[PDB]
A paper describes a structure:
We postulated that the height of its RBS has been altered with the presence of G186D mutation in Vic20 HA. The height of the HA RBS was analyzed by measuring the distance between the Cα of residue 190 (Cα190) and the phenolic oxygen of residue 98 (OH98) in the apo form. The Cα190–OH98 distance in HK68 HA with S186/E190 was around 8.9–9.2 Å, while it decreased to 8.5–8.9 Å in Fin04, HK05, Bris07, Vic11, and Mich14 HAs, all of which carry G186/D190. Interestingly, the Cα190–OH98 distance went back up to 9.4 Å, which was even larger than that in HK68 HA. Similarly, Vic20 and HK68 HAs had larger Cα186–Cα228 distance, which is another proxy for the height of the HA RBS11, than Fin04, HK05, Bris07, Vic11, and Mich14 HAs. This difference is unlikely to be an artifact of crystal packing, because the RBS is not involved in crystal packing interface of these HA structures. Additionally, the HA apo structures of Fin04, HK05, Bris07, Vic11, Mich14, and Vic20 all belong to the space group H 3 2 and have the same crystal packing. Of note, although the height of the HA RBS was similar between HK68 and Vic20 HAs, their receptor binding modes were markedly different. While the large height of the HK68 HA RBS helped prevent a steric clash between E190 and Sia-1, that of Vic20 HA RBS promoted the H-bond formation between N190 and the amide nitrogen of GlcNAc-3 by shortening their distance. Consistently, Vic20 HA, which has a higher RBS height compared to that of older strains, is incompatible with L194P26.
Residue numbers in the entry:
A (entry chain A), B (entry chain A), C (entry chain A): 11 to 325, 330 to 502
The structure:
Amino acid sequence: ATLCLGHHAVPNGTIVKTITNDRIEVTNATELVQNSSIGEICDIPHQILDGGNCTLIDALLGDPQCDGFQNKKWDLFVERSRAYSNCYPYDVPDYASLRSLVASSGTLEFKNESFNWAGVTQNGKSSSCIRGSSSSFFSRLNWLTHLNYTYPALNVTMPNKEQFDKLYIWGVHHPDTDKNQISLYAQPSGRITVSTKRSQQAVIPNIGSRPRIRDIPSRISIYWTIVKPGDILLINSTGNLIAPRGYFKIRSGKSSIMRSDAPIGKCKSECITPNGSIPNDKPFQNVNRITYGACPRYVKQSTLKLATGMRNVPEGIFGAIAGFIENGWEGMVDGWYGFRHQNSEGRGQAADLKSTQAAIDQINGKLNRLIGKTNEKFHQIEKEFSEVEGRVQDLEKYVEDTKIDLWSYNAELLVALENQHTIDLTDSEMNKLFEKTKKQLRENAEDMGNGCFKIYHKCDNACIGSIRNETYDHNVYRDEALNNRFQI
Amino acid sequence: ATLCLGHHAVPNGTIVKTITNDRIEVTNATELVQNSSIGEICDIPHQILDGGNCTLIDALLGDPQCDGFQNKKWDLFVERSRAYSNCYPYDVPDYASLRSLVASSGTLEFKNESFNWAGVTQNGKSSSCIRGSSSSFFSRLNWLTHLNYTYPALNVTMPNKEQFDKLYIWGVHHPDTDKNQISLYAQPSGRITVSTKRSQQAVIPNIGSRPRIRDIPSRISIYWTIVKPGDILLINSTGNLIAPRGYFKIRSGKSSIMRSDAPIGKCKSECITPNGSIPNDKPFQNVNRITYGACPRYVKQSTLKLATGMRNVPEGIFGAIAGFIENGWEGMVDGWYGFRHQNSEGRGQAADLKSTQAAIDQINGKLNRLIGKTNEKFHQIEKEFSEVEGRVQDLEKYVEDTKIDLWSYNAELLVALENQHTIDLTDSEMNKLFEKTKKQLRENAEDMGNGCFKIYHKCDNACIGSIRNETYDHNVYRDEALNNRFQI
Amino acid sequence: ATLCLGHHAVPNGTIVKTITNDRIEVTNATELVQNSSIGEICDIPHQILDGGNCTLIDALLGDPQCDGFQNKKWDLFVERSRAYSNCYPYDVPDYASLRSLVASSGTLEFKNESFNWAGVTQNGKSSSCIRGSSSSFFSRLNWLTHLNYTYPALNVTMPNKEQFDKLYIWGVHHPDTDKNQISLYAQPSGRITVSTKRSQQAVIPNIGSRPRIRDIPSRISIYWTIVKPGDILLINSTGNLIAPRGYFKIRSGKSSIMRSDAPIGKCKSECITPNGSIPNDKPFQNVNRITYGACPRYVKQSTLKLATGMRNVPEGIFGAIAGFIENGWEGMVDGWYGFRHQNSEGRGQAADLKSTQAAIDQINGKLNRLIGKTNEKFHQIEKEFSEVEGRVQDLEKYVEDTKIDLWSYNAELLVALENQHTIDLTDSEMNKLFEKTKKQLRENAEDMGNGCFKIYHKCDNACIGSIRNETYDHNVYRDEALNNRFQI
Ligand SMILES: *[C@@H]1O[C@H](CO)[C@@H](O[C@@H]2O[C@H](CO)[C@@H](O)[C@H](O)[C@H]2NC(C)=O)[C@H](O)[C@H]1NC(C)=O
Ligand SMILES: *[C@@H]1O[C@H](CO)[C@@H](O[C@@H]2O[C@H](CO)[C@@H](O)[C@H](O)[C@H]2NC(C)=O)[C@H](O)[C@H]1NC(C)=O
Ligand SMILES: *[C@@H]1O[C@H](CO)[C@@H](O[C@@H]2O[C@H](CO)[C@@H](O)[C@H](O)[C@H]2NC(C)=O)[C@H](O)[C@H]1NC(C)=O
Ligand SMILES: *[C@@H]1O[C@H](CO)[C@@H](O)[C@H](O)[C@H]1NC(C)=O
Ligand SMILES: *[C@@H]1O[C@H](CO)[C@@H](O)[C@H](O)[C@H]1NC(C)=O
Ligand SMILES: *[C@@H]1O[C@H](CO)[C@@H](O)[C@H](O)[C@H]1NC(C)=O
Ligand SMILES: *[C@@H]1O[C@H](CO)[C@@H](O)[C@H](O)[C@H]1NC(C)=O
Ligand SMILES: *[C@@H]1O[C@H](CO)[C@@H](O)[C@H](O)[C@H]1NC(C)=O
Ligand SMILES: *[C@@H]1O[C@H](CO)[C@@H](O)[C@H](O)[C@H]1NC(C)=O
Ligand SMILES: *[C@@H]1O[C@H](CO)[C@@H](O)[C@H](O)[C@H]1NC(C)=O
Ligand SMILES: *[C@@H]1O[C@H](CO)[C@@H](O)[C@H](O)[C@H]1NC(C)=O
Ligand SMILES: *[C@@H]1O[C@H](CO)[C@@H](O)[C@H](O)[C@H]1NC(C)=O
Ligand SMILES: *[C@@H]1O[C@H](CO)[C@@H](O)[C@H](O)[C@H]1NC(C)=O
Ligand SMILES: *[C@@H]1O[C@H](CO)[C@@H](O)[C@H](O)[C@H]1NC(C)=O
Ligand SMILES: *[C@@H]1O[C@H](CO)[C@@H](O)[C@H](O)[C@H]1NC(C)=O
């Protein structure tokens, strides 16, 4: 009889990389880089707030277009690229910081407080800012001006008797000319001081024309201050104050903001990118470096294939597969390793289950470590920029670039090491089965050098199956085999 | 005779992770993550300065509580969470930078210089700032005010004729009302310009009430300037100047500052965390991301076990241990690998020393690379923040988070690769000893398939020991063994 | 006959590190860290602009020394440590940002625009700034002063009708005294407002003496503004304006700036460091963390040797090399593995080519992954600093330090894993050749245990060569060998 040891193969393998080979074919591989999105942001499980035409800062200030956002909460605020401001022209020095801290807070919950604005006109309105079809203003701000050509000095307090922090939004009006200023504040100067026991902020307007926006050559500059529990807001101003009407709650949690034009859809997905939600089964992704939720790590590679089967040899360090075993068996489809025989009763093929399972268990162990194991990240740094800004922006970009290159390196090395190891451990299992068989046969068979044993005795199917199931008693046949083996 | 090859085992192993297995038992492991502190900061080898009730900035300015800190030096300044300011209310725009640069300098060494403050009153004092039981002021600052309702314009120089940089601390007084201002500086305005050939700083006070602190609604704002060798300080002011009394040395070295409430103890430890000193034998630690000195790298994992022995099989790619060798020998305690025999003279067990040592040397080589090899770091970035600040703070946190995830990844992969390798190299040594024995026996023995040889000749203890010590002469017994082996 | 299997060796090996060994000798290694520069910056392929005595900012403003730089473009601007300013004394608040954005733009292309400076004197000149031997000023700036003791308020626009962004450079003059100011601007105050639809910048001069530079106690402060397409520059000023004469193109690409004293040479090199160009064949370098172009990654190690041959054994997990094979063959120089024999016709040595090539192909595969594979980087962050700056500078340094430690770790682990693997795969190939030979010999030879087979039949050179070329027919000699092997 002949008893050959072998392993499966498939007509069409997959190419993977290893430590020693750029391109080597295995029976099967899995992709470790997510490269597509469904193109919509799924609305479960993160609570999504669609900004529509409104920036977060315009929803905060209370641009008329944004009244629908009063007191809203979010996990992710989604800012659309079409959003536009439609109220009095303003800027925020350090706009990105205010956006970041509100985004991260996750709430526009606002509480009216009553200030004693004694002796001034309130509720200044502007045609740059229409609510309905009347001249109006930021809902959350209070444009104070002279009463009876008098602007009495303001000096108001507001203790924080609460248990939590308060965020106050206020501003300073910069008139285009000295005429208004006088006209608005009955006053040449204008000075603002907003303070607490822990901070002081002082602003003076800068009179001058700026290019007209909805016909306004004036500007407002927006400022903020956080008042801690047991602290006191003190506003002392002699004009140009754009006053607050109350405070915002300032919370901490996992909330953030993302710039995206993707539609919101009715579906479930843990990981969100500006392109849309992406599955998070894989450890890496090449969709977007901007992510929110439990996401694969962003890498530069568009694909990285993890071998999930042995080297494919159609038709390793242990030398069996692609080694002394000449090729695989495409015809073996119920197992990874097995036996082919020829005896007096014919020719046959059977899978070895123990060795097959050993290989599969190891590979599934690798997959268990790599698949569905992603990290959750929420509010992060900005990673795209529309304007030149210098030093800090250089550092933000360099940080992200550095991180991406280090993760791309990790991904590349991981798959090469794993693949080399996978090819080796499957080669090993072939070798181990070979060696176990050899030892079973003792003096009754000889190794032909190609994975096949020549058995020197009558060996029927029962005999073969006794080999395959490790019950074979060499002693039964020894006399016969020695006689046949050692003749002249 | 029977000669069996085997390996030790222990009743109770340790569980480790590998590349293919989340949980596999080995004979022994070592922990690679330091997870506890002794809860005190050891005072050797770093020179520790306990701030007590004083912040570094208050020790710098000379708050009365802090006079004990004049001219002190440190490796690590320790700021306590109970520290509090007890002098005139002030702020420092960019407080964190001044703290960082003084902390990093490591010295409060101060040198009196004499300015020509011609025509003003000096040594302004305040009841907000008691030294003993008299009204006083920051020791290092000089509150200038009118002399005889006159405030002559100041215009003073101070060349740096030294070889080193000078740090000047100065300030600007912000009166609560226009009344003082007049009252203090006999003057409506107030202007400060501090300059060198390399820098210019210009400040104007902002009059206004701030909430009272030790009854003071005024504030001082603190500024600093560094004067290089061969440069000149020029102070030109018409009031509101809080003047310097001299300069501070500004050094470079390994000094830093840490926020901690841990007690200082009389002991030795290279690595300091806010929780206390930690041993630095291990390569990783999960105690605190804030560290000073030669410290293990901070990781997220609370434990990572490095295998320091073979797979434990009570009662691998090479297929011997947990393979054709059915189990380990708990009874073998003088070696990792050995021989059990049965001959005509009885039954015995001996350790193989060469193979044992081979395994142990490899594992100690791994340990030599990983244990006691930590990196020294001194002044770093801040990693904890008490207040919302926006963009730069977002980047500081994102940088640290990015770094921690990359080190946690390195640690996880390192231990999995090392452990897989350790199990494999110990399996190999078992296999190698088996193969060496087999070759010794030549035609005189047969492999039973389970690690045991059947020897087909009388083999006494001398004979066995000749095998174990590699002196066995197969030729001596060949005739006998062939006769016994190849009979009918 | 005797047929011994063996491997080459060399008298003098190289020491490398592995996972289990700090120091192990192999036949050969390659260095993976570039540690030297040619000491010149090669002028191909990057377009190099040598700043000479001029900083980029002085070439931008138009210091007389720098007129040779008008409208120049660069890939890399090289700033020399001897560069010095020689015009009116100025500063730029956020100097590092303006330098960074111009450096990164890569062009000083300037376009004259005509402003309506109605009613003022233009082309203010200064003896601090000689062009030829006449008093002069920054070429790109326009010092406006009174006409006939009148300073009419300026209010000018300049629409951006172009498709691209415009960068405007302007300034504010700070007179030393109130006398000039009046003298220059016929005016006590002075106010500047530069704005667009998207930004506003407002500056007031600060009167005061600063230390004289080329006899000037006044200073100019430089500002910039970027005007987007379809936007409008609006300058509204009542004095102290240092006006622009036009705009600069602001491009994006791969341009940068580097501080270096290295000479420019006529040669080709992809990677530039301040020390000079360096070859980029290796994956790592220890020359400089400042790089431009396709450069090896900076690591802390001065050397890391990658094994490119087997363990050197003059005169592994598979146990053959440095194992049951006692030593290598220095005399074998045409192959890595081979056969030595003794038969009736003498003693001989031949290389096995198949096994040699197998080893070499694997090692070349590793080298293909590591050599000549560097990453291109252009404008980055600054990595050296001449002055104390605090928080942001702390973060820039911490980011670079973090990155370097992570790459140094990667490099260290990569070479240790690769080397352990290289020693193992070459040990394997020795073992595989041994096993293949053994199987060829079937019952005609016995394994002596030291890599040598005793062949029990007459085996002439033809016979040997039939073994070495895998044609040997064991059946031919079996009768003879069994007779010799199994006698009494
Ligand atoms: C300064 O000049 C600007 C720009 O020429 C003037 O603003 C223009 O004024 C006209 C007439 O009212 C408006 O219809 C234009 O729309 C304005 N242009 C822009 C782009 O703002 C501005 O009024 C002048 N400033 C002063 C105070 O006289
Ligand atoms: C502006 O209002 C503040 C707050 O009401 C005044 O400060 C208080 O003044 C009283 C009377 O002297 C003190 O006893 C309180 O302790 C002060 N409160 C705080 C929190 O500062 C302040 O004096 C007013 N400012 C001016 C210039 O009139
Ligand atoms: C303030 O003092 C400075 C420094 O003493 C004066 O500047 C010096 O003036 C002299 C006389 O003209 C010059 O020759 C020196 O070179 C100046 N020194 C420096 C370092 O600037 C300055 O003029 C005084 N300021 C005013 C407005 O009186
Ligand atoms: C190939 O590998 C993937 C990933 O594990 C697996 O899900 C797929 O079914 C495999 N195909 C086989 C084993 O035929
Ligand atoms: C957004 O703005 C556009 C103007 O372009 C307006 O027509 C549209 O109604 C707005 N969307 C919503 C839902 O308000
Ligand atoms: C704005 O421009 C006009 C000049 O025509 C002038 O009346 C006013 O003073 C200007 N203001 C500033 C900012 O100088
Ligand atoms: C996702 O969005 C980014 C940024 O717009 C884009 O460049 C990238 O190609 C997109 N990826 C996919 C898979 O659509
Ligand atoms: C287990 O491993 C540790 C770490 O090397 C060692 O110090 C300890 O003594 C070991 N125990 C043994 C070998 O019994
Ligand atoms: C620190 O401050 C407390 C006031 O709470 C004081 O009682 C104590 O004496 C101070 N500690 C020292 C050592 O000065
Ligand atoms: C501070 O408040 C009082 C108003 O009662 C006033 O006399 C003084 O002008 C205020 N100063 C400021 C900062 O406007
Ligand atoms: C050390 O301190 C940090 C911060 O207070 C804390 O959260 C952590 O649990 C502490 N670790 C140990 C081992 O005490
Ligand atoms: C040693 O290794 C290097 C790097 O591959 C190679 O270029 C050199 O020629 C080698 N020397 C040999 C193989 O003798
Ligand atoms: C650079 O400056 C020096 C003054 O030290 C001058 O002598 C030299 O001519 C300058 N170099 C060039 C090429 O202009
Ligand atoms: C500069 O110094 C002189 C004092 O002698 C004075 O006339 C002028 O007011 C000073 N200016 C400032 C900045 O106070
Ligand atoms: C290159 O330059 C840096 C910074 O000057 C220096 O410290 C380093 O030693 C230099 N390296 C070489 C190879 O010259």
